[PDB]
Design a protein around this ligand. Sequence first.
Ligand SMILES: [Pr+3]
Ligand SMILES: [Zn+2]
Ligand SMILES: [Zn+2]
Length: 547
Amino acid sequence: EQSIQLTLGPWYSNDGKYSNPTIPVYTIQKTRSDTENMVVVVCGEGYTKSQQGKFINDVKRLWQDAMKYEPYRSYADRFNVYALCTASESTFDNGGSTFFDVIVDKYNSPVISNNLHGSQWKNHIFERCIGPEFIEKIHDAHIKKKCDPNTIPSGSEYEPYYYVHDYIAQFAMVVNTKSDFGGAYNNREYGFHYFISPSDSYRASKTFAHEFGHGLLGLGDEYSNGYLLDDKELKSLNLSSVEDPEKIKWRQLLGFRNTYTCRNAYGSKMLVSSYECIMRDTNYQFCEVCRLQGFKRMSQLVKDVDLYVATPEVKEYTGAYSKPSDFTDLETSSYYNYTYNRNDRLLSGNSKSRFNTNMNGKKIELRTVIQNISDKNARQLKFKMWIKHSDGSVATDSSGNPLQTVQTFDIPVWNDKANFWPLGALDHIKSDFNSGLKSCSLIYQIPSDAQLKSGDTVAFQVLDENGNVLADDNTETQRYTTVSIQYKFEDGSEIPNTAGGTFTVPYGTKLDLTPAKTLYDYEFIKVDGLNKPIVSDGTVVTYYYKN
Ligand SMILES: [Pr+3]
Ligand SMILES: [Zn+2]
Ligand SMILES: [Zn+2]
């Protein structure tokens, strides 16, 4: 079957338990060449050889649950996901020898323990052993190994393995356990880019998405502490200590959805853009700043994503939370007072029906934020907003003029792009949060003589230069559909060492990806199910490869 073979000398397996392991490789998802997608490699800790089927199903479960969160969900079909069936002598719960020597320290942190058996480089195993074998043999780039990982290179111990984390976007280690923990190890200068999370804890999927947010998306722990120094302020994608709303990096997002800067705990000098974010508390979704920053980060790792359009909202425009001085109080009470006010004004998503015939003479606001991913093409997006009767017709005033307004917004280029986690970067140092970023507000005065009827709602569209609808008043609550991937030989047999996963897309989506020319050594033949609206759960897209 498909596998990689490692050579682990005493620096990686000092007790000889894994001196020459054979590691079966399973493809969970490969929708395009590895050279065009983000490659995720997932290994199991504490799974015996007879438990590798549990491991594969565990990865599929955690991965599919991660793909339900924005911003990952927008990129769901642009990941290639591989499960490496690393076999431990002992299960994790039995407490004997495991592949990765993971221990849970006194702070409940899962840690690769170099000193457990004296394997002095154990926590370098991903970039020095697993990664380079994978990239030479499985990855479509087939980059030949450059250094013997069981010898000391001339010069830097680390530089020869930097290339690993450009071909493998993320290493994840799933522990076969119910224990609730999580850890992320992000220090590319010293080779570290992996996270560790449990298979069966009560919030295992939430933890996975969270540690994935640290690792791939570059997001900071919103539960952390302290006053950020100037260099750390520039460095952080989603944390701040800047109290002045006119200077805070994410000022353009203030007042959009639940973006209202606030202290992450009473008295804290550490500020978050939203109190309700998975990066502070794993029960939440990603906040709008994390969604933006993660969407930008992933755009650096693929080639064909050029625009981010946050989901627009419509709010009664009262003047509240409309200027910087409305955001100066950073207490949690101010955050929740802001979110209550938003709910009292909301006219979109699940509050569409709050529109009523008393809205004549009132102002409404269409609000979103837009990020240009291009550093070459400025963009011009047209917003349209109108009052729609329940039968779909456009409402009018008493003179017959449609209750409709339009405004075009100019989105400047992302000239700062090369400073924001580009391919090859060892870290993020400084970026201009506002480069390529435009908060867009379209305010409409509903006429006093508006001919409103019961059941009227606000409709809207964000349009590109060709009139294509990028978002509309149905986007937020639209139905998502599950699509299943299968890999088959031309005779219909399932390809061994594949375990095709599922993800979700908006109902009606036409998938349009160029399939990879090869799967392992199998040659691509044809695909069934692409370029066709996905309109049923369990829809199967079938990739056919020559045996
Ligand atoms: Pr052959
Ligand atoms: Zn955490
Ligand atoms: Zn966040």
